[PDB]
UniProtKB/Swiss-Prot annotation, chain A:
Phosphoserine, modified sites: S65
Function, as annotated: Exists either covalently attached to another protein, or free (unanchored). When covalently bound, it is conjugated to target proteins via an isopeptide bond either as a monomer (monoubiquitin), a polymer linked via different Lys residues of the ubiquitin (polyubiquitin chains) or a linear polymer linked via the initiator Met of the ubiquitin (linear polyubiquitin chains).
Cross-link Glycyl lysine isopeptide (Lys-Gly) (interchain with G-Cter in ubiquitin) mapped to chain: K6, K11, K27, K29, K33, K48, K63
Compartment(s) of residence: Cytoplasm; Nucleus
Domain of life: Eukaryota
Protein name: Ubiquitin
Disulfide bonds: none
From Swiss-Prot, chain B:
Quaternary structure annotation from Swiss-Prot or TrEMBL: Interacts with RGS14; the interaction is GTP-dependent. Heterodimer with RABEP1. The heterodimer binds RAB4A and RAB5A that have been activated by GTP-binding. Interacts with RAB21, and with 100-fold lower affinity also with RAB22. Binds TSC2, GGA1, GGA2, GGA3, AP1G1 and AP1G2. Interacts with ubiquitinated EGFR.
Disulfide pairings: none
Effect of A42G: Reduces affinity for ubiquitin 3-fold
The protein, known as: Rab5 GDP/GTP exchange factor
Domain of life: Eukaryota
Function: Rab effector protein acting as linker between gamma-adaptin, RAB4A or RAB5A. Involved in endocytic membrane fusion and membrane trafficking of recycling endosomes. Stimulates nucleotide exchange on RAB5A. Can act as a ubiquitin ligase.
Zinc finger (A20-type): 1-31
Changes after translation: Monoubiquitinated.
Stretches the record annotates as Interaction with ubiquitinated proteins: 1-58
Annotated positions binding Zn(2+): C3, C7, C19, C22
Covered residues, full protein: 17 to 74 of 491
Record's subcellular location: Cytoplasm; Early endosome; Recycling endosome
Length: 73, 58
């Protein structure tokens, strides 16, 4: 399925993912497209920072959901 | 009974009383408010990383 990951700086990343994907997995995917390392990434959906060991389905992230990416410094 | 937006179609219990089309409109509305809210939060959190970095190198 597709989900979109918006940055604050004018970019939307489209990812190919499964409800079963871990957050760690999704961040690996962002490293693939964007060259950003997983540990520089904070992902947000529905008011919450997403945890590395949980899956998209744990958050009811469905087809076409939009997450936000913030950079960790 | 009938759709709560007053559509003239029947609403579905599994969709809070709404019909297929009216429920898709509510769903879209909710998902826009969620994206706005997450944007606001991602601003807060970005402000905060830049500050935490800045006081770290100050
Ligand atoms: Zn209706």
């Amino acid at each position: 399925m597709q989900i979109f990951v918006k940055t604050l700086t004018g970019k939307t990343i489209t990812l190919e993912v499964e409800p079963s994907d871990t957050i760690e997995n999704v961040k690996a995917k962002i490293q693939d497209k964007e060259g950003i390392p997983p540990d520089q990434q904070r992902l947000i959906f529905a008011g919450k920072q997403l945890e590395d060991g949980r899956t998209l389905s744990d958050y009811n992230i469905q087809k076409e959901s939009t997450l936000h990416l913030v950079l960790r410094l | 009974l009938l759709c709560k937006k007053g559509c003239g179609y029947y609403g579905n219990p599994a969709w809070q009383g709404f019909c297929s089309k009216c429920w898709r409109e509510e769903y879209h509305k909710a998902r826009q408010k969620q994206i706005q809210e997450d944007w606001e939060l991602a601003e807060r959190l970005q402000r905060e990383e830049e500050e935490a970095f800045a006081s770290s190198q100050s």
